[PDB]
Design a protein that fits this description.
The structure is a monomer. The protein has a single domain, classed as Green fluorescent protein (Green Fluorescent Protein). It has one helix and eleven strands. The protein has an eleven-stranded mixed beta barrel. It binds calcium ion (2 copies). One calcium ion binds next to loops. The site of one calcium ion has 2 residues, from loops. Pfam families: GFP (PF01353). Keywords: Chromophore, Luminescence, Photoprotein.
């Protein structure tokens, strides 16, 4: 393989996710667990809002809640920054602007701890409207396919990304969420700095009929493209 970290993804890998959030002073925690199969770009996760009712819609947290599981095609293996940063991992930071509403600011560390890929995140949301699409829970429980556009940031030894999520609203409108992303390695080992490309990202949301807690089951399928 072209990076040592890529070797950690040839099988099925257990995933743990932990998020601490505060949106307009509404504090919440989310815990997720599942597994990823990067050979196929697939992962399966179940998330619980452990603090009670989630005060924002689940779809607004999908991008925040492990792009190391993307499938890079064989001719694109030299462009996979994410796996190359493993096991020590990377910091992923975003600002997410919900058009005509508030924003999320997130900082996460994605790294291996033993056999498990862990994504630990802090989220702060501000300036949301209490009767808007987010705090009013007006988003449909569904998700569109989107391209994540990646470029190298050679002075941070990392990458940048930007993309625009389109969230369907229950009355037929759309809520746009403009994402700005930066990733930086945690360790000092060499990483792969990619040519421009994108991640073709599909997400499917569902429920577990036996889970009484507020929760989201998420299936993702992601493949790199564009070289
Ligand atoms: Ca597509
Ligand atoms: Ca596609």
């Amino acid at each position: 393989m072209v990076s040592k970290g890529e070797e950690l993804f040839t099988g099925v890998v257990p995933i743990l996710v932990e998020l601490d959030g505060d949106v307009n002073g509404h504090k919440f925690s989310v815990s997720g667990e599942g597994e990823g199969d990067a050979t196929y770009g697939k992962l399966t996760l179940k998330f619980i809002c452990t603090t009670g009712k989630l005060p924002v819609p689940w779809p607004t947290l999908v991008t925040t809640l492990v792009q190391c599981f993307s499938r890079y095609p064989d001719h694109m293996k030299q462009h996979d920054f994410f796996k190359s940063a493993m096991p020590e991992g990377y910091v992923q930071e975003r600002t997410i602007f919900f058009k005509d509403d508030g924003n999320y600011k997130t900082r996460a560390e994605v790294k291996f701890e033993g056999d498990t890929l862990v994504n630990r995140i802090e989220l702060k949301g501000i300036d949301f409207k209490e009767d808007g699409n987010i705090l009013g829970h007006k988003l449909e429980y569904n998700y569109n396919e989107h391209n994540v556009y990646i470029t190298a940031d050679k002075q941070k030894n990392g990458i940048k990304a930007n993309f625009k999520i389109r969230h369907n609203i229950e009355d037929g409108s759309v809520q746009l969420a403009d994402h700005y992303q930066q990733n930086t390695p945690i360790g000092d080992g060499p990483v792969l700095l990619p040519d421009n490309h994108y991640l073709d990202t599909e997400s499917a949301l569902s429920k577990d009929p036996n889970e009484k807690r507020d929760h989201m089951v998420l299936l993702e399928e992601v493949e790199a493209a564009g070289i």
